[PDB]
């Protein structure tokens, strides 16, 4: 499984860890420990992006709140202060690995074991990674689309669906 026809798998990535399709052209994960951190960061960027994309489409589609780039409604420093106070111990404990000062105890800091239904395997890890990459792509799309089309992403989908050959990337 490769990202283009036969680009020779770069030797830092062999194919043990899920989501390997032999990419890494810049060789950013040439060292094993930086690869380890990159893996954490990939899955975490993924999971946030998936919440984010559901967030932005859901608020405009399902809850009729309006476009996601409208921020004039609420006071941003207040939400920021609240959000940072709430997120601080949770993002410390995640990075830490637990609650102790020397804390590297207990669970894994990428897969901490919050599965009631017991559905964690290599395949589901791959599925998580693949949906994460798609969501990251989508979230980048939303930002760039917001700055080029100047209107809501569902409005963008409306314009492509109405007339795809006239309304596309060469707007």
């Amino acid at each position: 499984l490769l990202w283009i026809p036969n680009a020779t798998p770069p030797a830092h990535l062999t194919g043990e860890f899920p989501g390997d399709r032999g990419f890494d052209p810049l060789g950013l994960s040439k060292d094993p420990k930086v690869f380890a951190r990159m893996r954490i960061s990939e899955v975490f960027h993924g999971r946030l992006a998936m919440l984010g994309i559901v967030g932005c489409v859901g608020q405009e589609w399902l809850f009729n709140k309006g476009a996601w780039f409208d921020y004039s409604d609420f006071d941003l420093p207040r939400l920021g202060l609240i959000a940072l106070q709430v997120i601080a111990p949770l993002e410390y404990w995640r990075g830490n690995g637990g609650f102790s000062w020397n804390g590297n105890d207990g669970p894994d800091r990428s897969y901490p074991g919050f599965d009631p239904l017991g559905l964690t395997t290599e395949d589901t890890k791959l599925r998580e990674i693949k949906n994460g990459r798609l969501a990251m792509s989508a979230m980048l799309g939303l930002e760039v689309q917001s700055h080029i089309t100047g209107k809501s992403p569902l409005t963008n989908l409306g314009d492509h669906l109405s007339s795809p050959f006239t309304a596309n990337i060469l707007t």
Binding site: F63, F74, D75, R78, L79, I82, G98, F99, S100, D105, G106, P107, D108, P112, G113, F114
Partner: protein, 180 residues
């Protein structure tokens, strides 16, 4: 003695073995590492819990009956008389609870956590765990009531009914986004 833990893959403290009801390996702040304190903590946990269970029914039920809200009771009721008369009534009862009996030296050695006031012989090491868990739930609840009292300034049944009627316009997010 298999027992569950409060957080997935953690390891329990070594002084929490499961020897006592409703142990879930939860003492990160190490407040029960010494055994004699763990004895008192155990009595305190059951007693704070029992009082929170009484409190939370006491707070909810007169508001359900339309007799008033629990944190507004002190404009119809004088606090200082209530608290004087209550401490007069409670004092010999609390005394005897801590004492272990009526005698000056304890004498009639009773359990000060689990006396025998049980006519149905229902006491097991399971019902003990149920009493603890219901109590912990009520303590968390009474914390909720107090914070909700300050933030929303309405009663708890009113707070529930508001969430049910307008779940998006009456929740912690919306109530803390505004000055409150």
């Amino acid at each position: 003695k298999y027992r569950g833990l409060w957080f997935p893959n953690i390891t329990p403290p070594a002084y929490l073995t499961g020897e006592f009801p409703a142990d879930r390996g939860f003492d990160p702040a190490g407040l029960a590492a010494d055994p004699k304190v763990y004895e008192r903590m155990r009595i305190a946990e059951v007693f704070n819990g029992r009082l929170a269970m009484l409190a939370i029914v006491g707070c909810v039920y007169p508001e359900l009956l339309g007799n008033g809200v629990w944190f507004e009771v002190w404009n119809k009721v004088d606090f200082y008389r209530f608290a004087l008369i209550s401490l007069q009534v409670v004092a010999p009862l609390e005394y005897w609870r801590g004492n272990g009996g009526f005698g000056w030296d304890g004498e009639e050695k009773y359990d000060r956590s689990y006396p025998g006031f049980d006519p149905c012989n229902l006491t097991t090491e399971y019902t003990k765990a149920a009493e603890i868990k219901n109590g912990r739930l009520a303590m968390i609840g009474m914390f909720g009531l107090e914070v909700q009292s300050h933030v929303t300034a309405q009663g708890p049944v009113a707070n529930l009914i508001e969430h049910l009627r307008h779940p998006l316009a009456a929740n912690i997010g919306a109530n803390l986004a505004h000055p409150w």
